[PDB]
Amino acid sequence: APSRNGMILKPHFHKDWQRRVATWFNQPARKIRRRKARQARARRIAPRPASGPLRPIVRCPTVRYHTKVRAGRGFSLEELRVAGIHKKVARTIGISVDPRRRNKS
Amino acid sequence: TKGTSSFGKRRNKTHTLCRRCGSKAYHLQKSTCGKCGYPAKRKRKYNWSAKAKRRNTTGTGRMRHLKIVYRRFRHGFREGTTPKPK
Amino acid sequence: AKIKARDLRGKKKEELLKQLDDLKVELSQLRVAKVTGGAASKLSKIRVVRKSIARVLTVINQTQKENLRKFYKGKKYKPLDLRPKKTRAMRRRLNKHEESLKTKKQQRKERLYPLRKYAVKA
Amino acid sequence: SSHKTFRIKRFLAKKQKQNRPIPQWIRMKTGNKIRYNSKRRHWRRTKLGL
Amino acid sequence: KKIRTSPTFRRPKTLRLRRQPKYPRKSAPRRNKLDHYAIIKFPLTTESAMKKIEDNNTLVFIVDVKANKHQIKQAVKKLYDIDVAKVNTLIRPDGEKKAYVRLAPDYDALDVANKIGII
Amino acid sequence: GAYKYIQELWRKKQSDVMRFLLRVRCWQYRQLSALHRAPRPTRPDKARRLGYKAKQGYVIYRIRVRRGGRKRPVPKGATYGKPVHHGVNQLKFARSLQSVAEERAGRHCGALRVLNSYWVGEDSTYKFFEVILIDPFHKAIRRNPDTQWITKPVHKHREMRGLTSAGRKSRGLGKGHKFHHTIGGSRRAAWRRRNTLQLHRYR
RNA sequence: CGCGACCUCAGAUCAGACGUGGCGACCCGCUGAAUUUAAGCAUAUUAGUCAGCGGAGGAGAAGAAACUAACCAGGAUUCCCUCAGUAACGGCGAGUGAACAGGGAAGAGCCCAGCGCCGAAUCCCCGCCCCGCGGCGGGGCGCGGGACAUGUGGCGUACGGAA
Ligand SMILES: [Mg+2]
Ligand SMILES: [Mg+2]
Ligand SMILES: [Mg+2]
Ligand SMILES: [Mg+2]
Ligand SMILES: [Mg+2]
Ligand SMILES: [Mg+2]
Ligand SMILES: [Mg+2]
Ligand SMILES: [Mg+2]
Ligand SMILES: [Mg+2]
Ligand SMILES: [Mg+2]
Ligand SMILES: [Mg+2]
Ligand SMILES: [Mg+2]
Ligand SMILES: [Mg+2]
Ligand SMILES: [Mg+2]
Ligand SMILES: [Mg+2]
Ligand SMILES: [Zn+2]
């Protein structure tokens, strides 16, 4: 029974949520595991960059952002054709290649 | 006469000892168990009786094959090798 | 008095059967002495005789199974007791060559475009 | 019932061999915490509803 | 020049081969774990059993439960080289089998009891 | 090649030749048992497009599934409770009958592995499907690197877990704005991520 | 009054293999209520929930767009935060309720059928020689068998491909 000027609240606790509580006590150990896997990968690829292949210049869609520049999924095939690098050689070199990206500009 | 005179004329049995679970559940008329379901090929278990599950999980009996499976796992599943003799 | 294993590794099979029969005679006599009472010096030897029977039968089973696997070693279909038993799925795995079988297209990919070794910022 | 089967007679034979008291040399052991058997079955109390 | 004599069509008896296996399923045959020594455990030193031996020309033995009367007969004849008139078996309420081995009257029971050790 | 001619020939099902062929094959397949091994594909172009390579080890079955919806397995009336669920006649089973045919084929042969299946005919009372089955243990499949993913134990009973093309369509999975379920692993995983509470360490 | 081929279907204690069942905490495909709430209750809610059935794996599933967007356009899937208790659904009542974009963890790409070109150039089993043979593999010797033109193998798959 709501009384004397509170918010008209709608709590979503009508299901069996206590069986499905996801406690997050794993997460500092998970940060340790991700750190160990990242260091093992960096020791695996010994002269190569630890982050990975080169990511392209990519501008955000959805006119909210519209000015930020991101890292992309990969360089497009027209970009590889103008740069003079074959699409099956660029992956061996360490250049990100995806065949899905258009190039309208 | 539904009490003591009805307990008096109890002679013949309905359930006997089964031969897969060994409990007194093998019904002589239906030829079924109802504790494991012997004429069925699958073991009778249900999730509404977790107590009856943990009466016979895999950690109950002798585990006479599964414990040496665990030991051969921690050893490495090697076969036919002998240690170096004296 | 002790029947060990090193002295049984090199004996003939009929002599092993004769020693086994002598141990069975001594085992039956010690059971008769156990039932008639006898003494504790006769009650204590039945364990030694049973373990000696176990050792003789163990050495016989060793020699016959190494002879059978020396016989079937080389054939393509060997018996199920001689086949290796690790686990069910591990016996139902691949052939250690079938996992390494690659197609001609994948070999052509790995041959024409191998993963190169590189470094940056120089 | 004098018309037993082999399984029932084998089960009852094992019950007879289990209905047996603890020998006196048990109690002189080192880590003993056993006083009596606590499974002494009598033929009137537990009736073996087989 | 072939007519259906019967109106029914029964399946024709086709040729089938026998088991000529390429490899045996087991490497060795199973050894006899029901030997003459392992089938006879011990005789009884009961006073009733000794009266049975002294009076009725028998020998009382305690036998494994998986045995036949023919197996007990050939077992006694193999172990102690004595002929058997008959073998008479019961099962005690302890799991073991009890064998009254009636001997042939040409051989004595008290003498062979002295040979096997009981008195 | 001839496979494109056979492809549009099996497309034009309403013409008189293909109606005669579907009538004769529907009669011939109805007069057989419910599940039987076919020695060669009746529709080889569709079998090849779904993955049948005519070599040793690829088996096909032909199977009859009854036609219609699903009646609720209850007694006489007797759906006890609120009047939402009392209808037992006009309710539909959420998984397709072609996947039911794959399911019954894999249940009859759990030793074989279901690849895919297709349609060979229908009656008013039955449908007729052809299910491609693969040996896990035959050497022509086991030594072929293109199709040795099937021999791996991860793909056991695709007909049961809904991993074939007939059972995958009943799962409602796909990319885009029209599904929005199975946007994790499946409907169960989407429900789980949307109805587990993430109570952190520091909140 | 028969023989020989093909096609469909049998019988084998035929030679060689596979599956049955258990556990089931996590996962997948189904099936699936009622307590409860709505101060009653009937849609709704509890709830794709409990129970029930099958199936595996060390993870499973999903997954490289018949996508999102309407922008100077992004670009497999999965998972965390935010979007957001929002758009929306609801006797519009109780209550239910995502997604895009953005910041991260990780990041990996591909193969077929068809279209066609190569003398089936392809694959399975048995006999013999050589290697270790305890997850039966490689080379050769066989007008030795079989599968296969009702299509095996190589090139080749939407990023185009072939001569
Ligand atoms: Mg990163
Ligand atoms: Mg009483
Ligand atoms: Mg309702
Ligand atoms: Mg998949
Ligand atoms: Mg659909
Ligand atoms: Mg199973
Ligand atoms: Mg209420
Ligand atoms: Mg109330
Ligand atoms: Mg459940
Ligand atoms: Mg997977
Ligand atoms: Mg797709
Ligand atoms: Mg997305
Ligand atoms: Mg809902
Ligand atoms: Mg082709
Ligand atoms: Mg190819
Ligand atoms: Zn039972």
Residue A105 at interface with chain C, using a CB cutoff of 8 Å: no
Q: Output F176-181 pairs: Cβ under 8 A, ≥24 positions apart.
A: none
Q: Which of D40, D1, D43 is nearest to D20 (CA)?
A: D40
CB B30, CB B15: distance < 8 Å? no
Alpha carbons A103 and A72: distance in angstroms, whole number: 13
- Tell me the C-alpha distance between B59 and B66, whole Å: 10
| DSSP 8-state secondary structure symbol assigned to residue A82 | H
Contact F136, F164 (CB under 8 A): no
Write the residue in C36, C77, C82 that is nearest to E27 by C-beta: C82
Instruction: Tell me which residue of F133, F121, F109 sits closest to F60, measured CA to CA.
Output: F133
What distance in Å separates the CA atoms of residue A51 and residue A47, rounded to the nearest whole number? 12
Backbone φ and ψ of F27, nearest 5°: -60, -45
**Max CA-CA distance within chain B?**
83
SS3 state of residue A61: coil
Count the helix, strand and coil residues of chain A and give each as a percent rounded to the nearest 5. Answer: 30, 10, 55
Q: What backbone phi and psi angles, to 5 degrees, belong to F63?
A: -145, 140
Distance CA F159, CA F131 (A): 10
Distance CA B20, CA A4 (A): 68
Give which of F147, F155, F52, F156 is closest to C101, Cα–Cα.
F147
Residue A51 to residues A7, A45, C82: CA-CA distances in angstroms?
48, 10, 51
What is the rounded radius of gyration, in angstroms, for the C-alpha atoms of chain E? Answer: 26
Spatial distance between the Cα atoms of B76 and B73, rounded to a whole number of angstroms: 5
The CA R_g of chain C, rounded to the nearest whole Å, is 29
Residue B70 CA neighbour count, 13 Å, CB half: 6
Are the CB atoms for B15 and B29 separated by under 8 Å?
no
Q: Are F57 and F135 in contact (CB under 8 A)?
A: yes
Q: Is the CB of E2 under 7 A from strand G?
A: yes
Nearest to C89 among F142, F143, F153 (CB): F153
Contact E117, D36 (CB under 8 A): no
| Cβ-contact E31, E38 below 8 angstroms | no
Rounded to whole angstroms, the Cα distance separating E68 from E60 reads 16
Beta pairing class for E97-103 and E84-91: antiparallel
**Residues sharing a CB contact under 8 Å with residue F16, sequence separation 6 or more, in sequence order:** none
Tell me if residue E32 falls in helix, strand or coil.
Answer: coil
Those residues with Cβ within 8 angstroms of residue D29's Cβ, 6 or more apart along the chain or in another chain: none
CA nearest neighbour of E35 among E73, E75, E62, E86: E75
Q: Do E93 and D14 touch (CB under 8 A)?
A: no
Q: DSSP labels for F71-98?
A: ----SSS---SSTTS---SSB--SS-HH
**Contact status of E92 with chain D (Cβ, < 8 Å):** yes
For G19, nearest residue by CA–C1' is F111
Neighbouring C-alpha atoms within 13 Å toward the C-beta of F104 = 17
Q: In 10 A of CB B65, how many CB atoms?
A: 8
Q: What's the rounded Cα separation, in Å, for the pair C93 and B11?
A: 58
Evaluate whether F27 touches F102 at the Cβ level (below 8 Å): no
F→A interface, C-beta within 8 Å: 192, 195-201
Question: Which helix H or strand E contains E43, and what residues bound it?
Answer: strand E40-43
Beta strand residue intervals within chain B, DSSP E:
15-17, 24-27
Chain F residues 165 to 184 with C-beta below 7 Å from nucleic strand G: 167-168, 170-171, 173-178, 180, 182-184
Taking the C-alpha atoms of residue F145 and residue C110, their distance in angstroms, rounded to an integer, is: 15
The answer to whether E94 and D18 are in contact (CB under 8 A) is: no
| Beta strand A21-23 pairing with F197-199 | parallel
SS3 content of chain F, % helix, strand, coil (to 5): 35, 20, 45
How many Cα atoms are found within 13 Å in the side-chain-facing hemisphere of F117? 35
CB neighbour class for E43 (10 Å; exposed up to 12, middle 13-18, buried from 19)? buried
Q: Report CA Rg, chain A.
A: 24
Residue in chain F nearest A21 by alpha carbon: F197
Residue type, B50: A
Find the F47 Cα to ligand 14 centroid distance in Å.
Answer: 14
Give CB contacts under 8 A, 24+ apart, made by F165-174: F165/F50, F165/F116, F165/F117, F166/F96, F166/F98, F166/F99, F166/F101, F166/F102, F166/F116, F166/F117, F167/F95, F167/F96, F167/F99, F167/F102, F167/F103, F169/F96, F169/F99, F170/F94, F170/F95, F170/F96, F170/F99
Buried b (16+ CB within 10 A) or exposed e, F107-132: eebeebbbbbbbbbbbbeebbbbbbb
CB of B15 closer than 8 Å to CB of B33: no
Residues of F in contact with A21 (CB under 8 A): 196-197, 199
Altogether, the residues listed in chain E come to a count of: 119
Closest CA to D42 of D26, D22, D24, D18: D18
Q: Tell me the CA–C1' distance in angstroms for E11 and G79.
A: 64
CA distance B27 to B46: 20
Quote the distance between the C-alpha of residue B39 and its chain's center. Answer: 14
Q: How far apart are the C-alpha atoms of E107 and E84, rounded to whole Å?
A: 10
| Residue in the structure block whose two tokens are 């020396």 | C70
Q: Counting Cβ atoms within 10 Å, is residue E84 exposed (0-12), middle (13-18) or buried (19+)?
A: buried
Helix (H, G, I), strand (E, B) or coil at F63: strand
Q: Which residues pair with A22 in a beta bridge?
A: F198
Neighbours of C41 (CB within 10 A): 8
Task: Answer for the pair B44, B37: CB distance below 8 angstroms, yes or no.
Answer: yes
List the alpha helices (DSSP H) in D1-50: 6-18
* Residue whose structure tokens are 């250049």: A95
Bridge partners, residue E58, by sequence: E102
Q: Please calculate the CA angle E38-E41-E45 and round it to the nearest 5 degrees.
A: 165
Contacts made by residues F183-186, CB under 8 angstroms, sequence distance 24+: none
Helix or strand run (H / E) with residue E98: strand E97-103
In order of A40, A52, A71, the CA distances from A55 in angstroms are 22, 9, 5
Contact F92, F72 (CB under 8 A): no
Q: Amino acid identity, residue E89?
A: T
Q: E36 and E69 in contact (C-beta within 8 Å)?
A: no
Give distance in angstroms: CA of A75 to centre of ligand 11: 23
Contacts of F160 (CB under 8 A, 6+ apart): F103, F106
Q: Considering only residues 73 to 112 of chain C, which have any Cβ-Cβ distance to chain E shorter than 8 Å?
A: 75, 77-82
**Whole-Å CA distances, C81 to B82, C60, E6, E29:** 18, 16, 52, 11
Q: Which of A14, A16, A20, A25 to mutate to test the interface with F (most CBs of F within 10 A)?
A: A20
F100: burial class by Cβ within 10 Å (0-12, 13-18, 19+)? buried
CB E32 within 8 A of CB E89: no
d(CA F196, CA F184): 14
Hey, what are A56's tokens?
């392209």
CA distances from residue B68 to A42, B71, C80, C90, C112 in whole angstroms, order as listed: 39, 5, 19, 16, 49
**Nominal resolution (angstroms):** 3.1
Ranges of H-type helices in A1-105: 27-44, 77-83, 87-93
Question: Residue A80's closest CA among A66, A69, A92, A68?
Answer: A92
CB atoms within 10 A of CB E98: 16
**Which residues 6+ apart lie within 8 Å of C90 measured at CB?**
B77
Rounded-to-10 torsion of CA F117, F119, F121, F122: 90
Interatomic separation, CA of residue B22 and C1' of nucleotide G33, rounded (Å) = 36
Residue B24: is it exposed, middle or buried by C-beta count within 10 angstroms (0-12/13-18/19+)?
middle
Helical segments of E1-119, H only: 36-39, 47-56, 69-79, 109-116
Q: Which helix (H) or strand (E) holds F168?
A: helix F165-168
Nucleotide nearest to F42 (CA to C1'): G150
Q: Are F166 and F99 in contact (CB under 8 A)?
A: yes
The CB-based long-range contact list for E33-37 (8 Å cut-off, 24+ gap) reads E34/E64, E34/E66, E34/E67, E34/E71, E35/C24, E36/E74, E36/E75, E36/E78, E36/E79, E37/C21, E37/C24, E37/C25, E37/C27, E37/C28, E37/E79
Cα–Cα distance measured from residue E31 to residue B9, given in angstroms and rounded to the nearest whole number: 53
The CA-atom distances, in angstroms, between C79 and each of C71, F113, F141 are 11, 28, 26
